[PDB]
Design a protein around this ligand. Structure first.
Ligand SMILES: NC(=O)c1ccc[n+]([C@@H]2O[C@H](COP(=O)([O-])OP(=O)(O)OC[C@H]3O[C@@H](n4cnc5c(N)ncnc54)[C@H](OP(=O)(O)O)[C@@H]3O)[C@@H](O)[C@H]2O)c1
Ligand SMILES: NC(=O)c1ccc[n+]([C@@H]2O[C@H](COP(=O)([O-])OP(=O)(O)OC[C@H]3O[C@@H](n4cnc5c(N)ncnc54)[C@H](OP(=O)(O)O)[C@@H]3O)[C@@H](O)[C@H]2O)c1
Lengths: 195, 195
């Protein structure tokens, strides 16, 4: 069994659509593409230069295609995304000219990939796919960056597929710009009591 | 002009409902009341102590009635809520047995209270009222406790009133139990660039 970590940038109110630029995702007429931009410093760059080390990858087709239009030309900056296998969930795509790209189609195939032998899997973007992974408790770890911003609309990290579940805060950090780094571990079932 | 702070206990996915006990709020058949119970410790107690200093209060009727059923009999632990004036939004309750209870019926009333002179206003619970506050940008600070848990359903802090807006992280820390204390300051507009 391989470990699956979901890495995500989110607003205070859990929005994750289009962090990196105004046209990254125009779904719904979303007007705040790029909201992650004003909050980038150099300690953040180091923090997730460590989070960008070589692994394998699991992606929704849309996030795969966003990545495939950029990163094949910037392997200097992120060699992990280019050298590691990228398993992509899609029914409409079967091949890519980006090397080390395998296309899966089912929950069953994701289960086989997790069972199979190989390096730990990273998930980036992939909100819809993440809903599928959450609903089947396939997500072993969460690396979140929470930014000091609220947006009403936009795709959400905790959406349709969220289940009730408990986590452990492995570690945390703060950013000179006001971003909270929070890395959680899956910890079984939700406990209730009385205060 | 008084400082309206909103204080709130939220899950990773931002559920606000019924933090303290299994029957605290059973709207929707919510089965996870008391989700903050396993996560309370000494450090949380001290941070609350600073947050429970004598202030004025602004509540939704429901949260006021939950508070009234318990807090007038425990003025030793939380004096401020008994001594301070409680401004309660309702069209249903015009008077209460609780000392220092004033009942407001409209948005204008909340603004006039804000325009007024007095102790700074604290807001606890009151998710629906909070929605009204957000929609008109009347909230100036946010003191959140984020808990390492996820629940699907439930009343959310950021809901049908959340508006796009920027914040400044004015403080943050972590409890040994794994909760993240994040206090934020309202900071003008949302900025987008290109990473
Ligand atoms: N905040 C961040 O960390 C971050 C980082 C990067 C990107 N993003 C954003 O992430 C978003 C990615 O777009 P998206 O989440 O809407 O789509 P996505 O998950 O990246 O990919 C959606 C596609 O993946 C396939 N798929 C996903 N789930 C499936 C399922 N449960 N069953 C069968 N097929 C499934 C389908 O492919 P087919 O149609 O081909 O069959 C589906 O159309 C964008 O908004 C992007 O800006 C966020
Ligand atoms: N996470 C935390 O920190 C925390 C702490 C304590 C409690 N809570 C939870 O907060 C929740 C409080 O219940 P709630 O959020 O449903 O309601 P609420 O905001 O506490 O009060 C509901 C009542 O307030 C009045 N009201 C609120 N907004 C109004 C508006 N825009 N216009 C006119 N009147 C308005 C109305 O009174 P009338 O109907 O009387 O006219 C409404 O019925 C509970 O679930 C509680 O468990 C959370």
């Amino acid at each position: 069994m391989r470990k699956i970590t979901v890495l995500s940038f989110i607003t205070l109110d859990g929005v994750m659509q289009a962090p990196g630029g105004p046209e990254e995702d125009t779904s719904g007429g979303f007007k705040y593409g790029g909201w992650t931009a004003p909050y980038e410093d150099e300690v953040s760059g180091k923090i997730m230069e460590k989070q960008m080390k070589p692994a394998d990858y699991l992606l929704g087709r849309k996030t795969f295609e966003i990545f495939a239009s950029y990163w094949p030309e910037h392997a200097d900056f992120w060699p992990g995304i280019n050298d590691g296998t990228k398993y992509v969930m899609s029914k409409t795509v079967k091949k890519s000219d980006w090397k080390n790209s395998v296309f899966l189609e089912s929950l069953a195939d994701i289960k086989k990939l997790k069972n199979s032998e190989g390096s730990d899997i990273q998930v980036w973007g992939s909100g819809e796919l993440i809903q599928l992974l959450f609903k089947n408790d396939l997500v072993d770890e969460l690396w979140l960056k929470i930014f000091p911003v609220t947006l009403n609309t936009g795709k959400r990290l905790f959406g349709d597929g969220t289940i009730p579940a408990a986590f452990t805060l492995i570690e945390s950090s703060v950013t000179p710009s006001g971003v909270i780094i929070a890395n959680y571990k899956r910890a079984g079932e939700v406990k209730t009591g009385t205060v």
